[model samples]
Target: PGYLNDIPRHGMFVKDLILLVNDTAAVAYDPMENECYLTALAEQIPRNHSSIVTQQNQVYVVGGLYVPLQSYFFQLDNVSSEWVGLPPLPSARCLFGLGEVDDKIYVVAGKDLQTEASLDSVLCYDPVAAKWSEVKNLPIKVYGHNVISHNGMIYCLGGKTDDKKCTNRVFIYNPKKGDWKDLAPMKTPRSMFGVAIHKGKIVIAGGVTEDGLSASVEAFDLKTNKWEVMTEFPQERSSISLVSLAGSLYAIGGFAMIQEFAPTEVNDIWKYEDDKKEWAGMLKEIRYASGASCLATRLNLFKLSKL
Candidate 1:
């Protein structure tokens, strides 16, 4: 449970770094002023896009194969403004979901990267021990889904399942118990979506399905263990990136695919106010995929504890 504390919110900006491992990029926040850095760890390089998570000041990036059809992640930390690499994902696949709960990271479903078949493997990462171990597989095979950890549970929600099929099924994993549970499905199935926990509920918005892009928003109540439809988002989007600020949720970027490997990047940000149950449009825009766009935040957990 000792991962991070009082994360610094300002002075955080992640630039688009070249993806060397799957479509994954690098982060520069909290640059190390002193220490040695590692150059490479995995041969299966990410494309120009991939997603990562930071635990105890170390970042683990995974899921790419919109550039390469493999799944794995490298644990890294800054050593004098350079990155030092650690372990990799136990399995190989890409375009999956990644989240952190307490000190553990969960890698959710992705596909085979080449065959285009969805995957159900779930891997747990520990920065302290520099180890990656297996958890329960997803309830269904899926890719490009939204994942987040809240209240000691990992939520894998909204993604394309089983060979390009999208669904609203919600899969939850509790690392403490090492068990999997199925939550209520959403009103609509979503792929390439973004998720956040707001006001004790999981807030989801802007995803793609077989019907295409969506601006719809929904929430899953952690206390009640139920789903509720909120007001629609202000924009229609798929492959969107979302985050929670204060008590509101922000949705940004993403668009339709031109091919299996490429998509038009979106440059819009929208906010969902929790109390009003409404959406407000914001003007901030950024181009981010997994590799081409990444903003790093300072992790205080490392300064306070050992990893």
Candidate 2:
């Protein structure tokens, strides 16, 4: 008993929580317990069109329309309350693709906020060094795409070209080769969609097709390098927040234009039934969030500063 008195406990970082981050605050949900709580940001207004991404359990809020300074590069610590500001980008960009791969955050092609046209630029941020450096540019220019990391490689998909046509084309980048190449395109094309990768499958859910909203969902099998039609969502949604909790996939909320009504908001959450290939509504609701993004990560609520 005397030797056991020296032991101390440290918390875990894989609690399987999902944070539905919006303009200013985040509503966190724990699917295991079906509990929800509100988490605040650093008091600065996030404005509209912010990209939220989490890597190594640390959340980063990227550029928005109103934030042009380094403040736009916001970092929310896993165990802290106040947000920390990072260095600004070498140049300005919006509507770009951002994701974490190889333990580093990568920002890919988008429209240059200053140039008024699409860009082929790519940037990577190493938080350990606290710096952003230029990487190999894309072979082509596309905007409004989804960028994610799978198996240590970067994948960019479902974006529009400079000519105003939406493309189902997919491109992948490998750091080892420092090259980007094409892959099997999606059967359907869309933007502002929900993108999630888990268990060797990349899932693309409801998003905006060229003409209208899309309800179809597709999955890309990395092992076989094939795209398969998965179950469609119940509704056509843009900006749907699809996240993988632990191992299960879930959809939070998104905005849909109800008939002729002004494109409105939805708050229902869905749990995927992998065995039946169906989606079961969880019947739990978060606040109607506009222009919000959902990220699946572990947030130790007990360690958070109650601000």
Candidate 3:
């Protein structure tokens, strides 16, 4: 029966699964299986509102809410099932944008706790060297922004400034040239929206604007150098964590407001179908601003036998 059990084992299909992390818990969901698996990260780190990304099946977690501010960073290795502590960030920050390019994580502008002001500082961390280093800073101080890496470049999308001015400015960083250049601005000045790249373009949806929560969604076509208004998101949300999975864009849980400034919880998830040019509800009863990522996992007989 030893070979009998092993024969049925298909190597773990690690992709298509989303890893969601927060102070509440770190859970991995298999859309195909419609199952959720609690990971070891919950006990490993108790931080919330952190930015997370997966590289080579390892999930890296960045800054989050912690007293004055948090510069802490941690990594969860799924293969080893261990949470590894990584070197802290160069500066304590929150509400920052994190993107990975060339296997290095780029931490962009964020609110500095010490100054209580927005920062234009930029930093990069190399996993192989286990070190963090300063990088070229942004021209404008911003927080509550989002970053995405595409085509060997990093893009910093719309965010809020220190003066609470919502900005539609778009900036692109080319590591090879070691410079940043402004691109066509977004149609709306917003912050904390669901941001991702789909169909070779940058997609943004539903963020807070000067007026209040915004349901407007738009995309920037890199080749065209123009922003196009897309179908509006059904709900107004901010501080959302977005990820591209299985050729679809998923907008995870984020916060909404009740009567103007009062915070309200949004627990549902929406998926955008490119073909339909519309969004459909995917999941509900979720937490807010928790990090999310798509990864693949291999399951063998021993791993499956436990279940």
- Which candidate gets the maximum TM-score versus the true structure? 2
What's the C-alpha lDDT at position 65 in model 1? Answer: 32
Of 1 and 2, the candidate ahead on lDDT is 2
Cα lDDT of model 2 by residue, 1-307, tens digit: 3584587678564366787666667767777687767665634536544454555667777775434432267777655555677765665777778777756777888877766789888888888899999888987798878888777799988887878888898889998787889899999888778888866798989888877788889999997989999889998888777888887999878777886775677887898899998999885566634456778877767654332
Superposed by TM-score, candidate 2 places the C-alpha of residue 146 at a distance from the truth, in angstroms, of 0.3
Q: In candidate 1, which residue ranges exceed 4 Å CA deviation? A: 1-57, 64-72, 75-79, 256-263, 275-278, 287-307
- Candidate 2 TM-score, true structure as reference: 0.88
Quality of model 1 by C-alpha lDDT:
0.61
Q: Which wins on TM-score, candidate 2 or candidate 3?
A: 2
Instruction: Name the candidate that leads on lDDT.
Output: 2
- Over 54-107, each residue of candidate 3 has an lDDT whose tens digit, in order, gives 444556777653423457788876565566778877678877888778788888
Candidate 3: regions farther than 4 A off: 1-12, 44-46, 65-70, 259-261, 287-307
What TM-score quantifies how close candidate 1 is to the native fold? 0.72
**Backbone clash numbers for all candidates listed:** 20, 0, 6
Task: Give the alpha carbon lDDT tens digit for every residue of 42-126 in model 1.
Answer: 3344553345545344555664432223454555544532344446565567677787887677777776656667788887787
